[PDB]
Design a binder for this molecule. Structure first.
Ligand code: HEM
Ligand SMILES: [O-]
Length: 153
């Protein structure tokens, strides 16, 4: 898992996100949808967003980015002890939303990108390593639940 030091870096980075949760969440989803338009198709409520300008102008997209990063933050603050928090998300994303684990890889990559973009020169090599490890742990634990359920997508 992650060391004590590594969790400290994760939660330090997370403080940056928390100062503007909606702004970070918006930019994460925009990066996901523009880089991987197939992901937009999983959201009936964002399918009407035909341009990045429309995406930026959508208050509902910001609202969802808030929901998404708030959930992730709750999970990260558990420092790996997140079975209760993670299980329902795994189950809704596999059985209801039909989200392949590839799409979680995409959003993980989008979070790293957004952190650099919003905090250029203030997201150090150690911090990137730690955040990357935490997102991998999150994805790996979801993947285990996906395997239980026989879900591929
Ligand atoms: C950091 C990873 C993610 C987190 C923490 C997360 C969290 C959430 C939460 C808390 C909800 C609302 C409750 C629920 O339905 O379980 C939700 C809904 C949803 N999620 Fe995610 N999600 C993540 C990644 C993704 C990805 C990558 C996609 C698609 C590419 C996706 C698709 C959806 C959809 C389609 C909904 C329902 C949206 C609606 O209200 O119409 N999720 N997610
Ligand atoms: O989501």
């Amino acid at each position: 898992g992650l060391s004590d030091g590594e969790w400290q870096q994760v939660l330090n980075v997370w403080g940056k996100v928390e100062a503007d949760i909606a702004g970070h969440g918006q930019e994460v989803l925009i990066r996901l949808f523009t880089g991987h338009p197939e992901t937009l198709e999983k959201f009936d409520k964002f399918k009407h967003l035909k341009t990045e300008a429309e995406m930026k102008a959508s208050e509902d997209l910001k609202k969802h980015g808030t929901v998404v990063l708030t959930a992730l933050g709750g999970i990260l603050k558990k420092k790996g002890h997140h079975e209760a928090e993670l299980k329902p998300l795994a189950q809704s994303h596999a059985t209801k939303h039909k989200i392949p684990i590839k799409y979680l890889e995409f959003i993980s990559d989008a979070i790293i990108h957004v952190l650099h973009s919003k905090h250029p020169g203030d997201f150090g090599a150690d911090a990137q390593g730690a955040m990357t490890k935490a997102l991998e742990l999150f994805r790996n634990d979801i993947a285990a639940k996906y395997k239980e359920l026989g879900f591929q997508g």
